[PDB]
Design a protein around this motif. Structure first.
Motif, PDB file in Angstrom:
ATOM      1  N   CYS A 163       0.835  -1.191   0.000  1.00 30.87           N
ATOM      2  CA  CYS A 163       0.000   0.000   0.000  1.00 30.87           C
ATOM      3  C   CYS A 163       0.869   1.240   0.000  1.00 30.87           C
ATOM      4  N   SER A 164       0.915   1.949  -1.124  1.00 28.02           N
ATOM      5  CA  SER A 164       1.564   3.246  -1.262  1.00 28.02           C
ATOM      6  C   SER A 164       3.003   3.328  -0.733  1.00 28.02           C
ATOM      7  N   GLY A 165       3.764   2.274  -0.963  1.00 29.37           N
ATOM      8  CA  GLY A 165       5.166   2.261  -0.636  1.00 29.37           C
ATOM      9  C   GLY A 165       5.399   1.981   0.812  1.00 29.37           C
ATOM     10  N   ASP A 201     -11.973  -0.633   2.253  1.00 27.48           N
ATOM     11  CA  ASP A 201     -10.764   0.149   2.382  1.00 27.48           C
ATOM     12  C   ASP A 201      -9.993   0.286   1.001  1.00 27.48           C
ATOM     13  N   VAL A 202      -9.622   1.513   0.604  1.00 29.78           N
ATOM     14  CA  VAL A 202      -8.832   1.799  -0.642  1.00 29.78           C
ATOM     15  C   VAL A 202      -9.252   0.911  -1.817  1.00 29.78           C
ATOM     16  N   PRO A 203     -10.577   0.865  -2.110  1.00 29.56           N
ATOM     17  CA  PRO A 203     -10.992  -0.148  -3.110  1.00 29.56           C
ATOM     18  C   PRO A 203     -10.489   0.161  -4.466  1.00 29.56           C
ATOM     19  N   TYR A 204     -10.197   1.435  -4.706  1.00 27.26           N
ATOM     20  CA  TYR A 204      -9.585   1.870  -5.955  1.00 27.26           C
ATOM     21  C   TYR A 204      -8.187   1.258  -6.197  1.00 27.26           C
ATOM     22  N   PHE A 205      -7.491   0.734  -5.187  1.00 30.42           N
ATOM     23  CA  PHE A 205      -6.248  -0.038  -5.405  1.00 30.42           C
ATOM     24  C   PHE A 205      -6.422  -1.500  -5.803  1.00 30.42           C
ATOM     25  N   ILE A 206      -7.644  -2.023  -5.779  1.00 26.45           N
ATOM     26  CA  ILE A 206      -7.844  -3.370  -6.344  1.00 26.45           C
ATOM     27  C   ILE A 206      -8.403  -3.215  -7.756  1.00 26.45           C
ATOM     28  N   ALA A 229     -18.118   2.017  -0.315  1.00 24.13           N
ATOM     29  CA  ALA A 229     -16.771   2.235  -0.789  1.00 24.13           C
ATOM     30  C   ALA A 229     -16.143   3.472  -0.213  1.00 24.13           C
ATOM     31  N   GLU A 230     -14.904   3.370   0.286  1.00 24.45           N
ATOM     32  CA  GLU A 230     -14.082   4.555   0.460  1.00 24.45           C
ATOM     33  C   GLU A 230     -13.775   5.149  -0.888  1.00 24.45           C
ATOM     34  N   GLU A 231     -14.119   6.435  -1.074  1.00 24.87           N
ATOM     35  CA  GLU A 231     -13.816   7.134  -2.311  1.00 24.87           C
ATOM     36  C   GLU A 231     -13.795   8.622  -1.989  1.00 24.87           C
ATOM     37  N   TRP A 232     -12.668   9.266  -2.227  1.00 23.05           N
ATOM     38  CA  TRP A 232     -12.443  10.681  -1.949  1.00 23.05           C
ATOM     39  C   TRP A 232     -12.844  11.632  -3.081  1.00 23.05           C
ATOM     40  N   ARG A 233     -13.072  11.086  -4.250  1.00 23.34           N
ATOM     41  CA  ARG A 233     -13.431  11.861  -5.407  1.00 23.34           C
ATOM     42  C   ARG A 233     -14.832  11.509  -5.940  1.00 23.34           C
ATOM     43  N   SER A 234     -15.046  11.490  -7.244  1.00 25.30           N
ATOM     44  CA  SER A 234     -16.383  11.182  -7.718  1.00 25.30           C
ATOM     45  C   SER A 234     -16.790   9.804  -7.325  1.00 25.30           C
ATOM     46  N   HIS A 296     -11.299   9.300  10.711  1.00 22.53           N
ATOM     47  CA  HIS A 296      -9.961   8.992  11.151  1.00 22.53           C
ATOM     48  C   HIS A 296      -8.793   9.338  10.176  1.00 22.53           C
ATOM     49  N   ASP A 297      -9.149   9.843   9.020  1.00 24.13           N
ATOM     50  CA  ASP A 297      -8.207  10.279   8.041  1.00 24.13           C
ATOM     51  C   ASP A 297      -8.351  11.774   7.779  1.00 24.13           C
ATOM     52  N   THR A 298      -9.022  12.510   8.638  1.00 21.63           N
ATOM     53  CA  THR A 298      -9.142  14.011   8.456  1.00 21.63           C
ATOM     54  C   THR A 298      -8.920  14.666   9.802  1.00 21.63           C
TER      55      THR A 298
END
Ligand SMILES: OC[C@H]1O[C@H](OC[C@H]2O[C@H](O[C@H]3[C@H](O)[C@@H](O)[C@@H](O)O[C@@H]3CO)[C@H](O)[C@@H](O)[C@@H]2O)[C@H](O)[C@@H](O)[C@@H]1O
Ligand SMILES: OC[C@H]1O[C@H](OC[C@H]2O[C@H](O[C@H]3[C@H](O)[C@@H](O)[C@@H](O)O[C@@H]3CO)[C@H](O)[C@@H](O)[C@@H]2O)[C@H](O)[C@@H](O)[C@@H]1O
Ligand SMILES: OC[C@H]1O[C@H](OC[C@H]2O[C@H](O[C@H]3[C@H](O)[C@@H](O)[C@H](O)O[C@@H]3CO)[C@H](O)[C@@H](O)[C@@H]2O)[C@H](O)[C@@H](O)[C@@H]1O
Ligand SMILES: OC[C@H]1O[C@H](OC[C@H]2O[C@H](O[C@H]3[C@H](O)[C@@H](O)[C@H](O)O[C@@H]3CO)[C@H](O)[C@@H](O)[C@@H]2O)[C@H](O)[C@@H](O)[C@@H]1O
Ligand SMILES: [Ca+2]
Lengths: 450, 442
Positions: A163-165, A201-206, A229-234, A296-298
């Motif tokens: 996950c993200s390095g 969690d981070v479904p856009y990474f699958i 889904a977790e999604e920060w954009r559209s 928990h992420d803001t």
């Protein structure tokens, strides 16, 4: 298929279980810190599941009927995104029995439970991953991960997908049917243990194929199981009927806070943004949106509002007015503060002299209004800018209407006549004080079925 | 009848020693810094030019009438010890400054009511000093009730006073000469442009005098306002022959009982207000001068123990009532203080020392009233919804308004249950903790 009907009546409370309530200090680790301590990426406070159970009254008195729990499976960190065994409650939270006890107490109270599905990655402590480090190409689990080669290393940069390095979060190989099988068994196992849905969690990474397979496995157990889904954009890609029932609505967060805290957007731009967001959300998924002002992420809502509790209350009026299920982040209701992670993961103080109880009561009022008015749960949404500092959120079912009017200036009047969507209300004018709100609805009366 | 214009009035009470010091050349030598604790003896140098200079504040609050505490030449900071009723106190300004204040007030549509202190004067007044000096041979010996000579304060005064106080000799209102002087004071300041008189301790004189006073004032003009200080039932003053109304200390006590003390509940508040209403005769409701605090009480915010939201409940109720609402200088910005002298602090003019959300809340209640005609001339009915929730319904010819005040942790009001409101309103309305709602309907 669309979002389950019950979402329309839900109100969520988000709990980071390391930090909610420490009921059982025999479960505490050796170096547990004092409960008022400043949260860090490494420290443990001892929050447990018995503490959740013990504080259900607070949650129900807030007006919430659904929990979203961040990860609770055995892990090495305080956030538990680095899972090491997906079939076990973390030993510091309690046992499977305690979990069972929470689910039963919740069912008795009409509370639903959504857990965090961390499927893109596990922790470096996971048995499968430890077996690959030790047994390398001879490990039965070598292709459950994406290891470039041997020996496995993290010492410069990881020589494996993560996950993200992040070294301690190795990426699951979701292209392996054995991994997908494990993943679906996790889904199914906790549903058998009594849960009501899963947050992705981070479904856009699958990838979407995998999420389609997940839907079928979940909805095959029951169509009323919620997937969000977790999604920060559209959100739109998640709402095609084949993956989630809605997303975390970070779009509406940014719009709301732009208006109430930042001052960057006026009511016209807020109204436009919320109407456009609404139109992009397919029919049948508006109710499945998980609306929020923080997580928990803001940073915490009240910190975003620089301590202005009344301004904060405008964000809560807006939150509770929107179509979709509102969610409060634990401790925001009593006015906890904090910067972004780890700052927002402070421990919940249970000594009520430290609470802002006018804030709590404000939020309860909004929740009660929403719980009482059918249109606030099942009505279509229209946002209406009245002037730069003033917006009406109108919720309409048939000829019925509810209106939450939100004003960020120093006071105003609203002529309910000459604003057509507000027309069925008998009040012709409504005053708003400085940083004021007003909540009105048409006379409603439950209709008899015989 | 009370003059009609009282229906559209909203008063701002000023204690002129403390409002604004615009002219340092008028300061006494013993003048204290503007930030000082108020005391029975200290002067801060407030003046009439200070009033003129902040008239924009008064207008921006939504006030259109001033009640000034006494301004005539005197020896105290409160000036109830007048020494010359036909002169502005030298520390306040000159007759020309007063004229200028009247003219700047007229230009902005602000009326002026002055304090009529006719029961007594100060020991420094020329007539009384003439008696101390010339005793039996003074032409003014019978303008007072002096027991014998020489005049002494020393153990106890040997002359009649206001409540035993040696520097407030009682005027002998039984002397036609004194009544003539008193009536000439009334006339004189009406000739200088004032709009009315507030009567100080009117219960210490007699109704006969007060009927002569009404005849003299209303004879200049029927629209000049007369309002009595009265701390108990107002009804003696409302028979049509003395005052147009009183200072509504009854509604002060009822409102604060509910919003501040917690001794009275919504049902008792409602009943008390409807009874008060029923006891006040027709034609005099509009003339009642409603208040939550004065120069003779602790500050509203201190009564509320610093709870600004609770205070806002008090103002919501104040501005909803039939009768003219009055804000006490500096309450709008949340000054605190115990009773006199503690409620007589200097008005701050740094906006960072104001509670501006309190100010804006009050302005909102004022604006609603100013905008809705039923809030000025509508019939008043109070109805309790709950132990903690009250509706004050005002009923106009073509429109009805309600101000709903809740002192609890939040509730919902079914507007069909306020039957005074309910023949053109079935909306439900939410109230937050310590919330209000203000609505109108054609
Ligand atoms: O791309 C995600 C993130 O990965 C690394 O940070 C590790 C973080 O792990 C957890 O974060 C989770 C969030 O809380 C979730 O709600 C969601 O966004 O997914 C992530 C990962 O499972 C943990 O809670 C955080 O404290 C950690 O920072 C990178 O270092 C970050 O830059 C990446 O954004
Ligand atoms: O009987 C009233 C009072 O008289 C003496 O106190 C002298 C006070 O004089 C002034 O008070 C006036 C009020 O401010 C008016 O609004 C109205 O009530 O009339 C009185 C007298 O003209 C002055 O402002 C106060 O600071 C003085 O205390 C007695 O000593 C008191 O006990 C009496 O109640
Ligand atoms: O979950 C922790 C994380 O949350 C926020 O960052 C969110 C998210 O932002 C990016 O993800 C985007 C993907 O790159 C796009 O491919 C996708 O379409 O849209 C997502 C967001 O929905 C990052 O790439 C990703 O790492 C991260 O999860 C905070 O901004 C961040 O600081 C937190 O660390
Ligand atoms: O004026 C300053 C004073 O204000 C309050 O007291 C008011 C007033 O109360 C009494 O007067 C009553 C009379 O005795 C009755 O005969 C009459 O009917 O009703 C009045 C009240 O309206 C006192 O007798 C009088 O001296 C006083 O002005 C505060 O309570 C007091 O502490 C202040 O000093
Ligand atoms: Ca001066």
């Amino acid at each position: 298929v669309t979002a389950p009907d019950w979402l329309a009546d839900a109100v969520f409370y988000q709990i980071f279980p390391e930090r909610f309530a420490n009921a059982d200090p025999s479960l505490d680790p050796q170096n547990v810190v004092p409960w008022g301590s400043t949260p860090t990426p490494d420290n443990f406070f001892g929050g447990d599941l018995q503490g959740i159970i013990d504080h259900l009254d607070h949650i129900v008195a807030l007006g919430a009927n659904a929990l979203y729990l961040t990860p609770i499976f055995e892990a090495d960190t305080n956030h538990r995104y680095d899972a090491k065994d997906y079939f076990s409650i973390d030993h510091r939270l309690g046992t499977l029995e305690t979990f069972h006890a929470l689910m039963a107490e919740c069912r008795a109270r009409g509370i639903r439970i959504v857990l965090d599905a961390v499927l893109n990655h596990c922790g470096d402590g996971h048995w499968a991953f430890a077996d690959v480090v030790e047994n390398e190409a001879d490990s039965a689990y070598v292709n459950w991960f994406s290891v470039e080669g041997f020996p496995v290393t993290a010492h410069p940069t990881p020589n494996y997908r993560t996950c993200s390095g992040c070294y301690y979060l190795p990426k699951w190989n979701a292209y392996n049917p054995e991994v997908r099988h494990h993943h679906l068994d996790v889904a199914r196992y906790w549903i058998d243990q009594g849960i009501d849905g899963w947050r992705l969690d981070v479904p856009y990474f699958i990838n979407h194929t995998f999420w389609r397979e997940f839907r079928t496995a979940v909805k095959g157990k029951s169509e009323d199981l919620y997937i969000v889904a977790e999604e920060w954009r559209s959100p739109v890609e998640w709402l095609q009927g084949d993956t989630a029932d809605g997303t975390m609505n970070y779009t509406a967060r940014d719009l709301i806070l732009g208006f109430t805290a930042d001052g960057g957007i006026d009511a016209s731009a807020l109204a436009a943004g919320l109407n456009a967001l609404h139109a992009e959300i397919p029919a049948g998924f508006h109710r499945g949106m998980l609306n929020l002002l923080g997580s928990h992420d803001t940073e915490r809502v009240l910190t975003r509002h620089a301590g202005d509790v009344e301004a904060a209350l405008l964000s809560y009026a807006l939150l509770f007015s929107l179509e979709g299920a509102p969610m409060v982040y634990y401790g925001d209701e009593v006015g906890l503060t904090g910067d972004n992670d780890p700052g927002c993961r402070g421990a919940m103080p249970w000594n009520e002299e430290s609470w802002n109880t006018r804030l709590l009561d404000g939020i309860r009022t909004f929740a009660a209004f929403r719980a009482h008015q059918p249109a606030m749960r099942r009505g279509r949404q229209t946002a209406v800018a009245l002037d730069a500092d003033t917006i009406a959120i109108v919720r309409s079912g048939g000829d019925e209407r509810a209106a939450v009017i939100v004003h960020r200036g120093e006071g105003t009047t609203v002529d309910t006549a000459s604003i057509p969507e507000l027309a069925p209300l008998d009040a012709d004018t409504v005053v708003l004080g400085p940083l004021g709100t007003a909540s009105l609805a048409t006379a409603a009366s439950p209709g008899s079925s015989a």
